[PDB]
Symmetry: D4
Subunit: 173 residues, 8 copies
């Protein structure tokens, strides 16, 4: 099937067509993979504005969005609030426990879930979902495992690319 990032397989489009929940890793997926730290204890992360638009589009097109994080951080809470993401698990790590809880609370089967990751810690959940996605510049060992590898790098619009894929697959782009 034709996409604005290049051809995708029929299998990936079919997986995309059925997604009701999009789970997004933060570091290296929503961000550039960096953490900015300062001498007064400041901590910043950089998110991508066009990803934000994609997320808002998904949320208004009957695709739930969730984030699972290993450490509570106000900046992540603030980003979720800005975007309307209400499913945020923090201080977890481990992703399976939150994944299982999320699926129970939403009554959504794993085949109807997509997950976008950049590192090996993402694989246990990615292995279980309907559409697993590695970002273009993910850890090299993750890349061949995923159903779809984005064209765009983490923090640069990989998430927008996935939102665009789901919306296209579902006739909502």
């Amino acid at each position: 099937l034709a996409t604005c990032y290049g051809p995708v397989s029929a299998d990936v489009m079919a997986k995309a067509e059925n997604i009701r929940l999009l789970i997004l890793d933060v570091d290296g997926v929503l961000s550039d993979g960096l953490i900015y730290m300062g001498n007064n204890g400041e901590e910043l992360k950089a998110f991508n504005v066009r990803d934000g638009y994609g997320i808002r589009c998904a949320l208004t097109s009957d695709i739930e969005v969730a984030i699972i994080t290993g450490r509570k951080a106000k900046l992540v809470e603030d980003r979720c609030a800005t975007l309307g993401i209400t499913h945020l698990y923090q201080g977890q790590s481990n992703k399976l426990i939150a994944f299982s809880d999320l699926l129970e609370k939403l009554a959504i089967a794993p085949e109807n879930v997509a997950y976008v990751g950049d590192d090996l810690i993402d694989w246990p959940v990615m292995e279980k979902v309907g559409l697993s996605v590695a970002v273009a510049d993910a850890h090299p060992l993750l890349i061949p495992r995923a159903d779809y590898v984005t064209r765009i790098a983490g923090g640069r619009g990989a998430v927008r690319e996935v939102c665009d894929l789901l919306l296209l697959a579902q006739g909502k782009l």
Copy 2:
């Protein structure tokens, strides 16, 4: 016509020659597309210094500059103040409402307006203006719609490239 970024078409040069108002998107055009967020509620964006010089040159060469934004932010107000941009619409529901108001207030026809964007939300106004510009690394669906696609990426000097184009077209470079 010859430019320091490579050839442009006669049609683009002719459009550029007539521009009295340059409207600039912020995120992904003036910036690198990122938003830096911190755990104390800090918010930063990165602007490009050579873009600033271009904007000052435009403003002193009888080309008005305006910005239309979806959310009031002191950092954008400050950037405008530094550069001498006085036409700033913030917290805007869309872009057409501010566009229409701007054109009435300035008594300038749409053909004498340029707009530089990076995403689909920019297209409704871009469709109406004399010179529409997509930055080099804009969303892929926007790129083919624009009159001119910059060589330089958002936040890296795309805006300077557009200012340089207008000034060259108008014999002011």
Copy 3:
């Protein structure tokens, strides 16, 4: 407006939808612009098989194909024979002459013609047609003049990309059949 090479404009797709004749330059469009010459007067030129597949798809999908080239070589006649191309004009640098001949011979309006070029010599014809195309690595002064600039370079599948575009625009891409020769 998605294509397998990237997005195209609505305007380019609409122009492509109307094409009944695809005219190609040879050197720099069907080849990468090289002319091979030997000490015994031998000459070679290299063509790309995936362009051959595109040309066969076009020819079998109601899109005629013609060639207008400034050089003259029997090898080009042979290439046309392989591909079933029956409209070849060689030794012609004033390409408007051949263009006028084709409009008459094929009873076709210029808006229903596409032309793929790489150098300034191609512009007089490109200016007149419904869909003008510059290959990705065309002369820098030709590039901004064309309706569509290919993603793929001359000799490397620019012609295939144009064939794919016409077929897609005309709803013929999925069912098109060619030989990659």
Copy 4:
């Protein structure tokens, strides 16, 4: 799973482990897709010596090699002779015919076959085999269909990369011997 070209999936490695016959397209796979033509009817094609080394390694490591190509040229018979390839089908664009012939002649199940292609004409056979491979610079519509996309371009060592993959999967890479010819 580590290779000298980058990680591959467990699925691709498992498919590779089972290959007893490697089928190759010629133009765009064993070459970069160019056909050289001259004024006296001469034709040349270019092959890559490191692909030759891979093919020799495969043939001496209990992996048979066959070629199915839409063009027909004596020069291809000569290249096969250099490399010891004894299964050549030329002038065939309906590649399923030659494929069926090979399955019978070599008494082999399709799951034990790999096919390396670059254009849509290759897909009907690729669809049926155990390991389908598109070269790095294959037609964009073929790329997403294949089990494995090579890192290296057609004519530049894509075939060598596939030979190396099969040998690695089968525990034969370290001890394989070839000639880089």
Copy 5:
């Protein structure tokens, strides 16, 4: 030997197999080589999250990690605390003085040490260790001196690449 970043020499793999202590330069190795400075005296540096995971893996796989720095900075102390790095020398004149001290305190021979650097100041210690590593975008004069040059740039996952190499060599990846 095969690695997920490409082939490495037998000699480099053999050096990697024996590493009990990994010493990491900060600027241009753990970071992007930048220092972010503000008008209120703010100072930030950007670390890479996937590097952090590599470091944690090394530390839980019997490979000690140390950092030697030329200026005490809370942000570096905080990064070390987050990752479990306890060997941090700051405000250092040399790197050799800290290196010597570290090896005495840990009773580890230089052949069992790896060092990852990006500039000429790193060379005196790199010259002495078992596995010297220059990052991909290190100063050009350092690159040919090192046993191994990473594929990944400083701040982008060069450190993760080295951790992955050590763990692979030691059968722990």
Copy 6:
């Protein structure tokens, strides 16, 4: 002549041999061309650590270093303090006035001065000096005017490249 960044002309090496004062533009030369602005009035710029080492090497090898700036900023003052740069002209812009003053105060001829710039505003002074340098990613109209165009981009080590060139030329690298 041979350099670690590639060949340079005999003319450029000869100009470099005679440099007693190196003048550095800040934005797009010492920095990445960005200015980071926040909603509490924060302003950050990013400097390159390896450039800092080059500057210290120049200063200890009888090459004075100066900076001329268009706006007083504590972050620039702090960077200069860290590096031992004592010739800092701020709130200037033009650059000729400071240049002339600097040369009078130091009793140095223009032929013994190098200047590294990235934009057209740098050209009037660059035109007068012994060794004019445009960074790799300077404004396109500046590039052909300079005696030397660096291989490395602004904020990424262009300044270190120039320091390395001067030191090599003077037999001090």
Copy 7:
């Protein structure tokens, strides 16, 4: 000054404005540096048609063209005949000899001459002329010596780029006419 390949210096433009004779190396300048050799003593070289267009534009715009090469091959004579080049020196590695001959034959001062080279053998003549040019992919030791370094590689349109530069400098670019052969 803006050019279609990027900005050039005022000094280069002023040098270009004064050129009445353009001297070209062959291998690595008019070609990508390859020499094709066969088992029967055949030899081929490849030239670029867009360079042909530039040469035709120059020759018809009062800029003479000459070639000085270290090799000797009839095929080079044939290429000169195609393009109307009437000043060819082959088998000459001490290129100062041919250069002196040209200055006398064409009654021209060295400042009115341009030379395009790719290797150190070209430098003795380049040192003497008004505009010296190294192609983009010239030997690294030649590159810093030249007045202008082309953006385009040898054999790929470096010569065209130089022709375009001279014509632009002389106010002849828009009206120049060539054949892309």
Copy 8:
């Protein structure tokens, strides 16, 4: 340790300083690895003129040059004749045989020999010499084994880069003279 291609290690420079014999593979080192084949049994190979210049510089600067190649073709004899190479071994895939012959014929210790290769077949000889070199685009499994990896690709000036390295290491680069043929 600065070179015109980038920095080299002190160890590589010291190895280069001692070289009296430079041995070259052909396919993939002196060429980009392609073999051109025709329907009448024609064969072509392409060599690079700047490599020719380096070889002439080496030969006139007390560095002998030899070739050991797995293929056999008269065209290679002709190339050696052009360049003054008098030590050619063709049809040889067990390259240790030719290597031993050279050591005896030239009364030379292996530490005074350099070898430039591109595939695994070259490794047995490379393992024994004072300076082993893999070209930039050598097979990925060869690259980490070599003392020096060239910056320039096979057929594109990797051999010239090695010649330049030896000459620089021996204080002969400035004064070296060649022909770019």
